[PDB]
Amino acid sequence: PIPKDIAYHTLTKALLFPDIDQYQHWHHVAPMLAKMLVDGKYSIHQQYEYLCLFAQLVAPVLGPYPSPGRDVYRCTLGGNMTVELSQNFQGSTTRIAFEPVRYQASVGHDRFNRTSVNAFFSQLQLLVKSVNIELHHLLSEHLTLTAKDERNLNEEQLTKYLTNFQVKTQYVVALDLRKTGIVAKEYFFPGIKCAATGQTGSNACFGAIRAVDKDGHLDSLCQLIEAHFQQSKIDDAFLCCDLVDPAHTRFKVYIADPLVTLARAEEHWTLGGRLTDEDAAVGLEIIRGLWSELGIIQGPLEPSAMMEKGLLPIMLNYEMKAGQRLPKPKLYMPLTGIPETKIARIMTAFFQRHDMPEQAEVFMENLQAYYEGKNLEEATRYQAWLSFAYTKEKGPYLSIYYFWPE
Amino acid sequence: PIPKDIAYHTLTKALLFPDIDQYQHWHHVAPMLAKMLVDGKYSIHQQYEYLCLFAQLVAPVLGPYPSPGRDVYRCTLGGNMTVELSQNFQRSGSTTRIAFEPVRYQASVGHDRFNRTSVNAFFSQLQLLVKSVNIELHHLLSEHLTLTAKDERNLNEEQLTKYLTNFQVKTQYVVALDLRKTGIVAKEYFFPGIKCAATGQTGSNACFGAIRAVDKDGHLDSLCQLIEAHFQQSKIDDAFLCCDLVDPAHTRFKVYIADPLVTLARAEEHWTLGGRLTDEDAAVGLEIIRGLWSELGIIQGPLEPSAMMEKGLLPIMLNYEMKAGQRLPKPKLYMPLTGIPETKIARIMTAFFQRHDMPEQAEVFMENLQAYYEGKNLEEATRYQAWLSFAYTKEKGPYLSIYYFWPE
Ligand SMILES: [Cl-]
Ligand SMILES: [Cl-]
Ligand SMILES: [Cl-]
Ligand SMILES: [Cl-]
Ligand SMILES: [Cl-]
Ligand SMILES: [Cl-]
Ligand code: NA
Ligand code: NA
């Protein structure tokens, strides 16, 4: 009788959306978000807080609702939207990631979608005082297309970028819905800047960290990762930082790799053997088991051939901490093509084995409620990624990133 | 220890108000409203629903925040605001009501002299969220109870000059949102005072003429005649009307009267409609009123409105509810409480609840009142609980309501 998304149905009776697009994003996103907040054991107060904050802060920057065939600025979050939900398993914590965008980006009034992230932060900082954007100001120059870079783009690239055909994402904001309060993260995608300058994504990322790391506290950590990227031949990197006072920030360098094999994931996990710690060694054994049990699909190396069956690359991020001698790895395993019931079976057995019986018991039930009425045996594109990190202290750290149905 | 107003503190972290006035109305109103919703035993979901609805629908029509000395269109709800909270207490429990005069800044700067547009802007928003709200009666009753273009042409120089500034209270419409657990019911109050200043008609004649114009088959004719005769005999002209904003077939009309003569004998005379109300519920109500009036010690103020306002004293009021089937109107008495200490009211309320088989109400009355006015001395305060309304049925027992004024 009392639905799991009651908080969504309740706020629906009280929120007056100013336009059809915000209305459609609320109805598309809020039911699943409400369920994930119930599942994560957030208090009723915090469920209402986060749903209302989503409505007030996030829905106005999701852009025109991307109805089938609509000529709008495109994004790939959640598969084909400007918003993606993910959940971390430890209770659970939910995360909302989105590319801030306004309609002007679809109608020729913001070619490289530069203004929306700025409009978004100016609203976010009014509600979440702990959000500090000093790093947004410092990093933008190094990781995004500047006026000077744009003057270097050729006729073919400019015509290609003039339409809504190309994905032009440079910024993604993630709101980590912690029970102690929201922490915002900013992702910088140097792809467009690099198309103009000729620099690699990894060179842009390290140059940005160096420009920001004033006392060179991260230099040795950077050198270790750089050397691995040079040796393993990886250029396609992007950066993530916490939007807190620069003193207290954490940088994560991400890489995407089209070669989807356990051997390639292992090579990146250990940074070509440079990561010698006990925690990384235990983690790789757990990964070997997970990769095998899940049966991660090896797709084509060509990006256009890869998207034919809707396959994803592997990804990793390396977390940098001033004090530590070694970076901390995180592996993202692509799950598109694997039936949802298979993933649920492997996850349930994993939780049981790693002393998380409360997670194991509800995994399937909760997944089925997010995709109510959908056949989870037939579906292969709902749970898109599984991320894995490990510490002896806290145990396995697993996250699921969801794609919107159909 | 979680604060009683946790839902207010929670929504404060999530709502981005577009201007300073909406922000100030939220902070002024929402803490007490959140406490009242906890006290009325509303589910946590409904607490969030009603607080958010107040923020989304009500705060945009409360107008500029009336800071001390600010030259803005004035209203007397809650004493000196455009918003008032009230609570109902019964055997079945407690419900909250939010009453407000829809107003926009244009009414303060010469762009809406008699504040005509704001109620229309408000309803166009309300009807999008509460589908059961029907405004057919607003369209029908406005002409009969408010200043029309034709009436305005009949205002003299003195009247027009006096109404041009923000000095005069020009309230013609008040909307009340009754926060029932089964869902919101909206009520509309029409004050014919400005129309009557122009036409020379009495408020009661305007009210009955409005009911007649709307009651197509004359189902309320005999009920109206009974009340009208009492008003003629007892010499009362100052009336206003309330209706439920539902399909006109299902509506309920209440005719209100204000009387500056604050005596038990005058309240009794109105309660029985000069002896016309002979039912048992009216006789029982009369017994209870006599006791309550005495225990509270309702203050008899001056008959002159300005001399009454000086002492901060209020008149008595009554309403008469009309039902097509019923042979007799149903009375409700409003007893003014300004000038009576809050702890005295609480003591009388607590004892009344205990005798009249309302022990749950009796137990928390004082505690709840103290939390609404946290840190305030309730022995010294005399202007927080402003009115006590009383109605009675054998079936449901005493029906009591407290109408609150904003502190300081
Ligand atoms: Cl900042
Ligand atoms: Cl700092
Ligand atoms: Cl994660
Ligand atoms: Cl209507
Ligand atoms: Cl009808
Ligand atoms: Cl009442
Ligand atoms: Na899948
Ligand atoms: Na009082």
From Swiss-Prot, chain A:
User: What are the record keywords, sorted?
Assistant: Aminopeptidase, Hydrolase, Prenyltransferase, Protease, Transferase
Coiled coil start-end: none
Q: What domain of life is recorded for the organism?
A: Eukaryota
Is Aminoacyl-tRNA synthetase one of the keywords UniProt gives this record? no
Q: Where does dimethylallyl diphosphate bind?
A: 95, 185, 187, 252, 254, 332, 397, 401
Residues that coordinate or bind substrate: 76, 84, 189
Q: Which GO terms describe its molecular function?
A: aminopeptidase activity; prenyltransferase activity
Q: What is its EC number?
A: 2.5.1.-, 3.4.11.17
Q: What processes does the entry annotate via GO biological process terms?
A: alkaloid metabolic process; proteolysis
- Report which reactions are catalysed by this protein: harmol + dimethylallyl diphosphate = 6-(3-dimethylallyl)harmol + diphosphate; an N-terminal L-tryptophanyl-L-alpha-aminoacyl-[peptide] + H2O = an N-terminal L-alpha-aminoacyl-[peptide] + L-tryptophan; (R)-benzodiazepinedione + dimethylallyl diphosphate = (2S,3R,11R)-aszonalenin + diphosphate; (S)-benzodiazepinedione + dimethylallyl diphosphate = (2S,3R,11S)-aszonalenin + diphosphate
Q: Which family does it belong to?
A: Belongs to the tryptophan dimethylallyltransferase family.
Job description of the protein: Accepts only dimethylallyl diphosphate (DMAPP) as the prenyl donor but shows broad substrate specificities toward its aromatic substrates. Also shows tryptophan aminopeptidase activity with preference for linear peptides containing a tryptophanyl moiety at the N-terminus.
Classification via PANTHER family: INDOLE PRENYLTRANSFERASE TDIB-RELATED, PRENYLTRANSFERASE ASQH2-RELATED
Q: Which NCBIfam families match?
A: arom_pren_DMATS
What is the protein named? Cyclic dipeptide prenyltransferase
The organism of origin for this protein: Aspergillus fumigatus
Give the gene name. Answer: cdpNPT
